[PDB]
């Protein structure tokens, strides 16, 4: 198969593994909750978003341990949680096509096949607070229980750039997808023009949203000496303006750390700052 330098994860068996997990399910999981429903919650809901148009599937993600297969998927999910969502976002759009190929009268077969969807695994495992966050927890899922305090308005992100030098007309749009904007040093739109002054027409290329939110843990069974400390949030999608400040929270997020510039005007840097990146809140 295709093995990556970065991860150790597989190829699209999980697509095939999801489909037999999803379609041949109809109920499971009674064995842990043995007290003593003929169709799975996901199956009817998969038809529901098809006729609502929404882009969000709130996956319980506590089924791969309640299914005989998908164990290695399940433990890769708690171990490479940036690639495996990017694999799973390809499946749901294609699994939507797997219901679209049945009846060809279903919303003209183009427009619900252009806007992307996304998934939301949540309630995965459990944590207990903040005095357990060890440095080895680099790319894992964390299940916090705390309190939101205050917010900020949205600052924008750099998802696409724009350029134009002083020729008559040049509307290129360079992508970034990094921490590095790359630039040319030669002209364009002619066969003979020198290394010209390339200008940065900033207010033309589109930007999405982003919001940082400050959290402090709820002082839960604190031993009457310790002060509840802080951590921050970063959201990307349309979970903005729904996390208003002042309510109890249970977040479902990944982990990330960033460097800081030590001098404000140099690129020199080293006690890092971390944060979390939310995939789904509650």
């Amino acid at each position: 198969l295709r093995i990556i330098w970065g991860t150790n994860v597989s190829i699209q068996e999980c697509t095939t593994n999801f489909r037999n997990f999803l379609m041949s399910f109809k109920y499971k999981f009674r064995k842990i909750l043995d007290e003593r429903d003929e169709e799975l919650y996901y199956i009817k809901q998969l038809n529901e978003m098809r006729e609502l148009g929404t882009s969000n599937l709130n996956l319980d993600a506590r089924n791969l341990l309640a299914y005989k297969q998908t164990e290695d998927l399940y433990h890769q999910l708690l171990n490479y949680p940036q690639e495996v969502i990017s694999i799973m976002d390809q499946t749901i759009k294609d699994c939507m096509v797997s219901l679209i190929v049945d009846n060809n009268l279903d919303y003209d077969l183009d427009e619900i096949e252009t806007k992307f969807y996304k998934v939301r695994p949540y309630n995965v495992g459990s944590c207990k607070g903040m005095r357990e966050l060890n440095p080895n927890d680099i790319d894992k899922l964390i299940n916090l229980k705390g309190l939101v305090l205050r917010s900020t308005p949205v600052i924008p992100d750099m998802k696409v750039a724009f350029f134009k030098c002083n020729v008559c007309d040049h509307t290129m749009a360079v992508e970034i997808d990094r921490g590095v904007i790359q630039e040319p040093a030669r002209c364009e739109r002619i066969d003979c023009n020198e290394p010209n002054s390339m200008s940065l027409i900033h207010n033309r290329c589109s930007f999405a949203d982003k919001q940082v939110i400050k959290l402090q843990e709820t002082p839960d069974f604190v031993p009457d000496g310790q002060t509840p400390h802080s951590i921050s949030l970063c959201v990307y999608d349309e979970l903005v303006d729904s996390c208003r400040a002042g309510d109890r929270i249970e977040v479902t997020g990944t982990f990330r750390s960033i460097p800081i510039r030590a001098n404000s005007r140099q690129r020199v840097l080293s006690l890092y700052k971390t944060y979390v990146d939310v995939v789904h809140v509650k």
Partner: peptide, 15 residues
């Protein structure tokens, strides 16, 4: 090749 950093290949300690 233009260099940049990596997180998972960088062992980090406590402090």
């Amino acid at each position: 090749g233009q260099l940049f950093m990596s997180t998972r290949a960088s062992k980090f300690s406590a402090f």
